[PDB]
């Protein structure tokens, strides 16, 4: 349970090849979380690819009224 990062040496956490949202930021793209204590590389977001073509258009057929807060 010894891991080497760009910030330094992390002792006491397991490195996992999985990716999650950041919980406890370490530095240089490494985050730690307690699921024992694990260390991983934070996931930037859910990957998506949009079907671009030069004669295709996507038009909404419905809508949703959304309410959000701001403090």
């Amino acid at each position: 349970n010894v891991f080497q990062t760009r910030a330094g040496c992390l002792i006491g956490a397991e490195y996992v090849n999985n990716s999650y949202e950041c919980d406890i930021p370490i530095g240089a793209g490494i985050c730690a979380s307690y699921q024992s204590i694990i260390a991983y590389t934070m996931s930037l977001g859910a990957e998506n690819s949009v079907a671009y073509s030069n004669n295709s258009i996507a038009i909404p057929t419905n809508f949703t009224i959304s309410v959000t807060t701001e403090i």
């Binding site: 295709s56 038009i59 809508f63 949703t64 009224i65 959304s66 309410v67 807060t69 701001e70 403090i71």
Partner: protein, 228 residues
Amino acid sequence: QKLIANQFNSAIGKIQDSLSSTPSALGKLQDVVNHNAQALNTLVKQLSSKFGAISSVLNDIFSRLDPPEAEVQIDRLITGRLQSLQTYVTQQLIRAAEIRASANLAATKMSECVLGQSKRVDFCGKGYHLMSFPQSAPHGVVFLHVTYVPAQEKNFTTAPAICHDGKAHFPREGVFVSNGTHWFVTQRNFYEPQIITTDNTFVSGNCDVVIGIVNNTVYDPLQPELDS
């Protein structure tokens, strides 16, 4: 109308529940309160430092030492306490500037989202802005941004223009779409197909220059009237 009203009511209820069920929602206001309390507590805790003197109590310094050196000790304590108080004032000024910036932003948000409808993207919430509702909070304000979000999209085939009788027709406000066999014109933000006529299209030049133009007919509303 009824569907939109139902969605709005459900969204408001969900806002109430989400605020009730998340502890760190008001973290910014809680941080303001905590910062002020912590600064005051640090200032009052700093009063128990010797600053290199023989004691941190003025009465002991005065009742134990001859004034010629008692004044040196008192000078040490006075300058240390004055320095700490200066540090407190400076950090308070910096925090006041930060809060001033936040309050200016809040006033702008009020004037532009509450007193009107804002075209600025993501300024008044995520999505197309409809309206905002202010709510008061301790040391702050809370905005409820009502926004319009498209959903349930569908693929279509589009063309920039329609060539008819050697003329090119362009949509007035909509877009040309095809369901596979027939062409319609619909507004961009909501699928509502309509027959392509000369009322919702305008003509400009021939169909030799536009790239991607397609052949189709353009119905004339005036022809059937004269056909009778």
